[PDB]
Amino acid sequence: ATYLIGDVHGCYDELIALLHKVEFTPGKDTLWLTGDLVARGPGSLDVLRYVKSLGDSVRLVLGNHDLHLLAVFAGISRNKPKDRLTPLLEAPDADELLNWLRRQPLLQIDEEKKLVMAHAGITPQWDLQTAKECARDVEAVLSSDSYPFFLDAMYGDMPNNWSPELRGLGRLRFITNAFTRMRFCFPNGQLDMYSKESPEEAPAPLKPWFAIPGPVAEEYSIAFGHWASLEGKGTPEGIYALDTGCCWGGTLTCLRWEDKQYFVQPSNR
Ligand SMILES: [Mn+2]
Ligand SMILES: [Mn+2]
């Protein structure tokens, strides 16, 4: 069976309880995770140890908090106490875990399931070939020996409009924002990097990225996490918003792909 789970945010106990609920069995089953494995919840260290141990039985995409963790580890960014990352950063296997994490994809595609996953979704300005190329480019910088330079370059809110002519720092910044920070778009598809509200609460003319027809969404189902204020609700057919805010006192959500059956684990917080 195929299981897709939204943002874990250090909620190790809830993750394991939910996997036990569905009797997740590596070798029979595959788990997809929307990223943001770490921060806020108490168990980021245990989450990374477990997910790394799954090997080919897990298909991960990196989220914005995973990248922030890498930036803290590399000395690029300051540690925020509320993220509760110190046990992971101080662990004797921190290097092993974080060098594995920075090698993981930004984008997962299964052609037989016609299923795409990224942390924030797929901007309507991208077709599939462009999304693949951009994921490859950023994965290449993250898996290189020079990844601290890219992590430093990644921060920024511009440019917010895709063009194949984009080059350099702006190109990498846009790619990172589209895969890991996107929520709202302007009517022309341009990213808004400020509004984090639910769609009903957003200022006009902002609309969810998935409310603008894009070429990937027309051919593929898209699973994503990230957007907790969406509460996993309000999406069109073929769009699966799996982040139901476990670390916020919400729930951890698991979707089984074969029958589109949902399983939910309440937050312990
Ligand atoms: Mn998140
Ligand atoms: Mn996120």
UniProtKB/Swiss-Prot annotation:
<dbReference type="GO" id="GO:0016787">
    <property type="term" value="F:hydrolase activity"/>
</dbReference>
<comment type="subunit">
    <text>Monomer.</text>
</comment>
<dbReference type="GO" id="GO:0015949">
    <property type="term" value="P:nucleobase-containing small molecule interconversion"/>
</dbReference>
<dbReference type="InterPro" id="IPR004843">
    <property type="entry name" value="Calcineurin-like_PHP_ApaH"/>
</dbReference>
<dbReference type="InterPro" id="IPR004617">
    <property type="entry name" value="ApaH"/>
</dbReference>
<dbReference type="GO" id="GO:0016791">
    <property type="term" value="F:phosphatase activity"/>
</dbReference>
<comment type="similarity">
    <text>Belongs to the Ap4A hydrolase family.</text>
</comment>
<dbReference type="GO" id="GO:0005737">
    <property type="term" value="C:cytoplasm"/>
</dbReference>
<dbReference type="GO" id="GO:0110154">
    <property type="term" value="P:RNA decapping"/>
</dbReference>
<dbReference type="GO" id="GO:0008796">
    <property type="term" value="F:bis(5'-nucleosyl)-tetraphosphatase activity"/>
</dbReference>
<protein>
    <recommendedName>
        <fullName>Bis(5'-nucleosyl)-tetraphosphatase [symmetrical]</fullName>
        <ecNumber>3.6.1.41</ecNumber>
    </recommendedName>
</protein>
<dbReference type="InterPro" id="IPR029052">
    <property type="entry name" value="Metallo-depent_PP-like"/>
</dbReference>
<dbReference type="GO" id="GO:0010165">
    <property type="term" value="P:response to X-ray"/>
</dbReference>
<dbReference type="Pfam" id="PF00149">
    <property type="entry name" value="Metallophos"/>
</dbReference>
<dbReference type="GO" id="GO:0008803">
    <property type="term" value="F:bis(5'-nucleosyl)-tetraphosphatase (symmetrical) activity"/>
</dbReference>
<comment type="function">
    <text>Hydrolyzes diadenosine 5',5'''-P1,P4-tetraphosphate to yield ADP.</text>
</comment>
<keyword id="KW-0378">Hydrolase</keyword>
